[PDB]
Design a binder for this molecule. Structure first.
Ligand SMILES: Cc1ccc([C@H](CC(=O)O)NC(=O)Cc2ccc3c(c2)CCCC3)cc1
Length: 293
């Protein structure tokens, strides 16, 4: 699984307005590279990687003139430093969550104006087609999504009335969603990822304050356990895993748009500041793939 020359890509984001940046961080030497801008600015999107290609999914273009929720799927090839449009999703999805099962991209929840989706759809890259699958049991915007052992988890979010501590799991062979144990803490816009045999939920927003607490769901024991908290409270953060460590990027803490990137080491249960982004921003999409050539 580990290979040399992989970077942490951050796409889009929000600061005053939705952003077009694509920038890549190299943990091996601490450098940032600025790459090809997104064709359309977008915040509240999600990123993922299939077959060494980076995908930017959903979001919203919050611009000086208006707010346009995105149904777009766009693909970045590091070999060419170019974005290519793909088939669009069935519906615009801002504040989206995304996960990949066996090379297929799942787009989960999100908002379209005042509409809060429980719908879910699945993208087939070779066929360039989206199709709807079973909807979630709960409408979730700002939902955290991660895949472990070819099961897809949807964690927290906002249903239009309450921020959520609930979570649920999608079982592909049954096309069926089931509730799992609820988190200890209500979290909207948390960073959600997979590390070892646990689903981590870092930070988020409870309608009052941004959070620095982090908790992980053990898919075997079905319990949520707090780990060491992040140094900086944040919601609408980006998150990814690289070489056995969690990286959180940016977000909003109620006072500033963070540029800080923290790295969690599960062997020592400690966070450390590893770098800063080129500028503070929230609502980014993040994924890991090979460096451009
Ligand atoms: C991508 C995403 C995911 C979840 C959320 C949730 C959605 C909810 O619970 O209302 N909200 C937050 O976290 C709070 C927040 C986050 C970013 C910003 C602000 C407020 C205000 C200033 C602009 C930036 C927002 C965005």
């Amino acid at each position: 699984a580990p290979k040399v020359g992989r970077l942490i890509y951050t796409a889009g984001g929000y600061f005053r307005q939705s952003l077009s940046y694509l920038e890549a961080y190299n943990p091996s030497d601490g450098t940032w590279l600025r790459l090809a801008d997104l064709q359309v600015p977008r915040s509240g999107l999600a990123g993922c990687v299939v077959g060494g290609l980076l995908y930017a999914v959903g979001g919203r273009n919050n611009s000086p003139d208006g707010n346009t929720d995105s149904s777009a799927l766009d693909c970045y090839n590091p070999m060419t430093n170019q974005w290519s449009p793909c088939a669009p999703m069935s519906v615009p999805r801002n504040r989206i969550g995304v996960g990949v099962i066996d090379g297929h991209i799942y787009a989960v929840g999100g908002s379209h104006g005042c509409i809060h989706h429980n719908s879910v759809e699945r993208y087939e890259p070779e066929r360039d087609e989206w199709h709807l699958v079973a909807p979630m049991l709960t409408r979730r915007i700002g939902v955290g999504v991660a895949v472990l052992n070819r099961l897809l988890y949807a964690v927290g979010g906002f249903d239009g009335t309450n921020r959520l501590n609930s979570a649920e799991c999608y079982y592909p062979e049954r096309n069926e969603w089931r509730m799992i144990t609820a988190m200890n803490t209500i979290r909207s816009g948390a960073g959600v990822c997979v590390l070892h045999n646990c689903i981590y939920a870092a930070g988020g927003y409870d309608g009052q304050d941004q959070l620095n607490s982090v908790e992980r769901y053990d898919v075997e024991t079905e319990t949520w356990t707090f780990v060491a908290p992040m140094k900086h409270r944040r919601s609408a953060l980006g998150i990814t895993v690289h070489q056995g460590r969690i990286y959180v990027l940016g977000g909003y803490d109620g006072h500033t748009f963070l540029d800080s990137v923290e790295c969690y080491d599960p062997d020592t249960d400690t966070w450390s500041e590893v770098t800063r982004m080129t500028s503070g921003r929230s609502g980014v999409g993040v994924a890991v793939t090979m460096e451009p050539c």
